[PDB]
Design a protein. Structure first.
Ligand SMILES: Cc1cc2nc3c(=O)[nH]c(=O)nc-3n(C[C@H](O)[C@H](O)[C@H](O)COP(=O)(O)OP(=O)(O)OC[C@H]3O[C@@H](n4cnc5c(N)ncnc54)[C@H](O)[C@@H]3O)c2cc1C
Ligand code: HEC
Ligand code: HEC
Ligand code: HEC
Ligand code: F3S
Lengths: 537, 97, 418, 45
């Protein structure tokens, strides 16, 4: 088992790197913990999933968990992820290993960051700014946007948003009824509701159909209108590379110059397999890249690979989320469209970022018939009275989030734990998470705004969550920086001491930002494409 | 012992048409959840001519799977599947079906 | 617009002379598949070094209606010159204006036809042409049928060359005029019979259904796929409505030419009401891929964007050769810049790559529950389609064993002289 | 140095590689020799 470049993790980031590399000539190998999972099988799983797991969103059950290197779960938990800290609930965030990565399930909201967010420390004096500026990243945004087939609100000027030097490949599909009603009332209130760029096909694209509002867009989309990592993995594998499922990587071999030159990886039954290649890439996850770097502490490397500043597994970030749920006054008929159409982008920037965190109100468009039917059933109704209750609670259901920008505080960490093992004996990772008074003040303001939206709809049975909820995208974990002694990776995605290790993953970012953010993950993975090529040409 | 399960509740109090033998797979499963299932289900047919003002025990064979007295209750404005302009200004408001 | 433009539109003369949509139209490069090989179509723009800028009226006409290149060689019959032959000498010079005046010269080499065994020598086609009797006294406007009908025989046969894809072929890969517009499989696909046969053609189609199919490619009982998607979005939709009414008229007049064992016209074959029980199951393995866009009962969507599999001319055919191409490659039209698409489900598919076995089961379920129950798909009737259809009995010659044997056997006749 | 491929075994189960003369005993290989053989008769004329 050898090739010109090894990449591990057949997700959005690893697959985009694979497709670009093979397109430019150098052969490639993909190794991913999960199996080859096919979209139809996942859809069949989801259809038969009990309507309690549909009522409150479960995004992992339809993807059957491999026993050897499983993925997380939160309906009654499998305890793969252990989370510690005052706001431990916030980091109960789920991933889905397998070819295609966690991107198999995702509302596909693919945002561009603001230009400030790359200069956060240099602008507001908090957090740490990125290594490069948005102007140095724009071409990779546009390449990723073209490759994933991203939608957009092309014909509009909205709000704080990245400056677009190139139009979105498609144009936004028209709003359903929920989004029109929400944007009208919240315009009445004082907030702006502008469409979310998404990786759906509003017209047929790339050879896969147009979105028809299946509204199953987070767990799995049956027809392929939205984007998944498996598309890039398929294109690269057909282009000439190789992919190997179940190939759990557990140890990496190096010299005293600390250049990576081999890895030993388990297959499902603990048999070791060894791989040699000119340049190695780790693209696992914001959680599984720091865990792997901590697991492969060597004879040369006592406490972690590329740990010259003791930051791998440290500075874990994710957007804390406040929920809401009530019944509108006039009907909302939520469900037409996709799962995540609009968003209140009005707050994503301003003069407050030096005082508290920038939020992004939105709401959730997933259909209510499931949950509303179950609620009206468990209200013990019967007959036409039950049916009328089902219709009312499904034509009035509402769901709103309010994410936040969390700072990187080094007291957060990813100590890979001891209390739990698996069918390989590899540690279950454990995260220490604290949110900071930054987002505490921001979250007080968010609770007020959410209650005000609830009143504006005339909400009844308003049941806010009190505890911060996860938002499933992992930021921070291997921070970039110019100085090698306070930051792992550099402005070109190459770990400082391991001059041959490229870390294309969401752990690399230095700011959680305010928006669903695997586009930057995918548009920094395509940054490492040129770094590899120029260094191996 | 299926025609005393399909016919049990009503046309209106439940699906007016058949379960489309999704109850012929329910009935098999209710045999295992209740050995005495096929016994009481006959006894609840003559009594509509105590037995669930507090004995909620047979609601579980009318709740369920969701079967929210359902492929669903109100399919003319929502999905589970419908054509691309699913949006049509929400259609109706409470004109049941 | 321009009359010279209109003929290239009607003659579809750009579906072959520009590789893909993104090419520069009338430049060449669209490698049309063929049993003999992949002939590469040639540049037609008036370029003085690459295209046909050097061609004159008599040098053009020889190419168009007799398939002879400028310098002398024989053009491969990938041309519909046997369909373009009877074209009037007036329209041939009308095309000539359009190509020399209207289109824009492009400077590029055009990839050449890399053919195997003797089919690569062009000059033998004159031997082939005389066997195919392709010289046919250019079209003279008939008088016993009104001009609405005359144009129909002039569009179906000469300009749009409906035959060159529909009417079958003989052993020698030549038009087989006994069954005229009766339907031969075309590489992967199969052009259905389009005679007037009521239960075995399109004679049962409603008149306003037939016009609506040709103009757009979308109708309740039939959606155009494959090489018609490439024909409707490229030529027919631009024809003025008066022209299609000619084609509609003529199609109603063609004598019926029947089929082996049919019981109902392809678009009436209603389907059994069944479902699955909530892999290796035609009732589940369909519901897990096909039932999202269509429904579980195959009735489709409620306004038409997703066609009803019940009473569908691609299901209700006794030959399921189309229904295996529709699953394998999907359908992709573009009429008035509104592209309706269906994902491919083949091996290199991107939404869900089914297996050569699995497609049959879903193909076999749909036929049993929606299509002609007599018509069935074997697990390896699909591998033929992925390969390109059954080999016509002439491509067998292009394998070195089949000629070497003809070599020594051929030489062994020399000794028989002695 | 000596190794067995997964299909060096299917040859043995079949009876070993076909000697270059048994190829003649399949009707295609003779029919081709037929018409090619006849085509020499016309070459006389
Ligand atoms: C509910 C939800 C919402 C989302 N919302 C958004 C959104 O708003 N915006 C957005 O941009 N994205 C969103 N996402 C997508 C998410 O940001 C990306 O999918 C993610 O960044 C990519 O992760 P992955 O699937 O590629 O991981 P993978 O590629 O699956 O990682 C697999 C790797 O882990 C390694 N591995 C596994 N186990 C071990 C072990 N024990 N030891 C060592 N190595 C191991 C394997 O070797 C392999 O290399 C969402 C996802 C979900 C589920
Ligand atoms: C696909 C069915 C085609 C259609 C429709 C048209 N042309 Fe064509 N043409 C085609 C091929 C595959 C070839 C080369 C094959 C060969 O035997 O060499 C050609 C060639 C010509 C030529 C010869 C001059 C040259 O190729 O350089 C001419 C003049 C030509 N084609 C013209 C032409 C016109 C005017 C058409 C519209 C009426 C037209 N072709 C349609 C394939 C196809
Ligand atoms: C939506 C993404 C689809 C899924 C999944 C499947 N089909 Fe489909 N199909 C779809 C469309 C939008 C169309 C027609 C486009 C148009 O312009 O009308 C079709 C067409 C077919 C056909 C033939 C229709 C025709 O040729 O007239 C068949 C036989 C068919 N579809 C079958 C089929 C099967 C077997 C599927 C699962 C493997 C399947 N479809 C999925 C949309 C979609
Ligand atoms: C080859 C490029 C063709 C040309 C030129 C014409 N037709 Fe055709 N036809 C062709 C195919 C590949 C198909 C459908 C294949 C499938 O399996 O779905 C068709 C179908 C039709 C039909 C519908 C017949 C039916 O579905 O029962 C009609 C009415 C039809 N085609 C008409 C038609 C006309 C009038 C043409 C001349 C303008 C014509 N076709 C050209 C293949 C090709
Ligand atoms: S399932 Fe796919 S079809 Fe669109 S509305 Fe959802 S992204």
């Amino acid at each position: 088992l050898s090739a010109d470049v090894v990449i591990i993790g057949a997700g959005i980031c690893g697959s985009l790197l694979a497709h670009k590399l093979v397109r430019n000539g150098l052969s490639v190998l993909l190794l991913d913990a999960g199996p080859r999972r096919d979209r139809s099988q996942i859809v069949e799983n989801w259809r038969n999933m009990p309507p309690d797991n549909k009522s409150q969103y479960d995004y992992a059950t339809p993807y059957p968990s491999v026993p050897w290197a499983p993925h997380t779960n939160y309906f009654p938990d499998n305890n793969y992820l252990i989370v510690k800290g005052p706001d431990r609930t916030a980091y109960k965030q789920g991933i889905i290993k397998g070819v295609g990565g966690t991107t198999w399930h995702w509302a596909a909201s693919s945002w561009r960051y603001l230009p400030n967010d790359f200069k956060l420390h240099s602008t507001y004096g908090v957090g740490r700014d990125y290594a490069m500026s948005y102007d140095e990243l724009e071409p990779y945004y546009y390449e990723a946007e073209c490759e994933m087939g991203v939608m957009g609100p092309n014909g509009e000027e909205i709000t704080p948003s990245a400056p677009r030097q190139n139009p979105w490949p498609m144009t936004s599909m028209p709003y359903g009824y929920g989004d029109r009603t929400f944007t009208e009332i919240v315009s009445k209130l004082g907030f702006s509701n502008t469409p979310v760029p998404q990786a759906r096909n509003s017209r047929p694209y790339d050879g896969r159909p147009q979105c028809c509002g299946n509204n199953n867009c987070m767990p799995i989309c049956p027809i392929g209108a939205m984007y998944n990592g498996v598309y890039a993995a398929i294109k690269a594998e057909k282009l000439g590379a190789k992919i190997i499922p179940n190939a759990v990587v557990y140890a990496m071999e190096t010299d005293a110059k600390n250049r990576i030159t081999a890895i030993s990886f388990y297959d499902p039954d603990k048999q070791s397999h060894r791989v040699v290649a000119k340049t190695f890439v780790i693209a696992a996850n914001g959680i599984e890249t720091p865990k792997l770097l901590l697991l492969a502490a060597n004879d040369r490397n006592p406490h972690g690979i590329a740990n010259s500043s003791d930051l791998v597994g440290r500075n874990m970030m994710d957007h804390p989320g406040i929920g809401m749920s009530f019944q509108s006054a006039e009907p909302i008929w939520a469900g037409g469209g996709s799962v995540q159409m609009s968003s209140i982008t009005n707050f994503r920037d301003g003069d407050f970022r030096s005082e508290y965190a920038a939020t992004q109100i939105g709401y959730n468009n997933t259909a209510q018939n499931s949950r509303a039917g179950m609620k009206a059933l468990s209200m013990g109704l019967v007959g036409k009275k039950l049916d009328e209750e089902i219709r009312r609670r499904t034509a009035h259901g509402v769901d709103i989030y309010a994410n936040h920008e969390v700072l990187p505080d080094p007291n957060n960490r990813l100590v890979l734990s001891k209390d739990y093992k698996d069918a390989l004996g590899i540690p279950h990772p454990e995260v220490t998470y604290d949110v900071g008074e930054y987002v505490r003040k921001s979250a007080a303001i968010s609770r007020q705004r959410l209650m005000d939206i609830a009143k504006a709809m005339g909400g009844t049975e308003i049941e806010m969550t009190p505890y911060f909820t996860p938002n499933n995208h992992i930021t921070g974990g291997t921070i970039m920086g110019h100085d090698p002694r306070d930051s792992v990776v550099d402005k070109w995605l190459r770990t400082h001491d391991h001059s041959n290790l490229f870390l294309a993953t969401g752990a690399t970012m230095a700011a959680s930002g305010t928006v669903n953010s695997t586009l930057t993950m995918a548009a920094l993975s395509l940054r490492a494409a040129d770094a590899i090529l120029n260094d191996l040409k | 012992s299926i025609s005393d399960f399909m016919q049990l509740s009503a046309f209106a109090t439940g699906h007016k048409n058949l379960d489309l033998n999704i109850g012929s797979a329910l009935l098999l499963a209710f045999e295992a959840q209740k050995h005495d299932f096929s016994t009481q289900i006959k006894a609840l047919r003559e009594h509509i001519t105590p037995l669930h003002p507090t004995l909620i025990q047979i609601i579980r064979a009318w709740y369920s799977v969701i079967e929210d007295e359902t492929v669903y209750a109100f399919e003319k404005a929502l999905m589970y599947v419908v054509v691309i302009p699913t949006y049509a200004h929400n259609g109706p408001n409470y004109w049941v079906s | 617009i321009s009359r010279g433009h209109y003929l290239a539109i009607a003659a579809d003369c750009a579906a072959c002379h520009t590789n893909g949509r993104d090419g520069q139209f009338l430049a060449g490069g669209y490698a049309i598949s063929s049993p003999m090989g992949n002939i590469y179509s040639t540049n037609i723009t008036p370029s003085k070094t690459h295209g046909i800028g050097n061609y004159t009226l008599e040098q053009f006409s020889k190419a168009l209606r007799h398939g002879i290149r400028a310098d002398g060689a024989q053009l491969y019959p990938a041309m519909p010159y046997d369909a373009y032959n009877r074209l009037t000498d007036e329209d041939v010079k009308s095309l000539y204006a359009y190509i020399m005046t209207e289109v824009k010269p492009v400077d590029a080499p055009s990839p050449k036809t890399q053919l195997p065994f003797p089919f690569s020598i062009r000059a033998s086609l004159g031997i082939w042409k005389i066997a195919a009797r392709i010289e046919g006294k250019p079209y003279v406007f008939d008088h016993t049928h009104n001009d609405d009908w005359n144009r129909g025989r002039y569009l179906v046969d000469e300009l749009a060359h409906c035959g060159e894809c529909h009417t079958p072929r003989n052993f020698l890969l030549a038009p087989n005029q006994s069954a005229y517009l009766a339907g031969a499989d075309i590489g992967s696909w199969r052009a259905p019979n389009i005679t007037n046969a009521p239960q075995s053609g399109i004679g049962s189609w409603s008149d306003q259904d037939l016009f609506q199919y040709l103009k757009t490619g979308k109708t309740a009982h039939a959606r155009a796929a494959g090489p018609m998607a490439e024909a409707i979005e490229h030529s027919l939709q631009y024809l003025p409505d008066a022209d299609i009414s000619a084609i509609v008229t003529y199609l109603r007049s063609v004598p019926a030419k029947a089929e082996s064992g049919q019981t109902v016209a392809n678009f009436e074959h209603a389907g059994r009401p069944s479902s699955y029980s909530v892999t290796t199951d035609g009732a589940a393995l369909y519901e897990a891929v096909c039932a999202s866009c269509h429904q579980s009962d195959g009735k489709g969507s409620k306004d038409g964007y997703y066609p009803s599999l019940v009473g569908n001319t691609t299901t209700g055919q006794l030959n399921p050769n189309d229904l295996i191409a529709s699953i394998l490659y999907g359908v992709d039209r573009t009429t008035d810049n509104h592209e309706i698409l269906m994902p491919a489900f083949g091996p290199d598919s991107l939404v869900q790559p089914l297996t050569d076995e699995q497609i049959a089961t879903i193909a076999d379920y749909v036929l049993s529950h929606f299509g002609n129950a007599q018509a069935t798909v074997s697990a390896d009737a699909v591998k033929q389609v992925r390969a390109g259809g059954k080999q016509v009995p002439l491509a067998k010659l292009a394998s070195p064993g089949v000629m070497l044997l003809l070599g020594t056997g051929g030489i062994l006749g020399a000794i028989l002289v002695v």
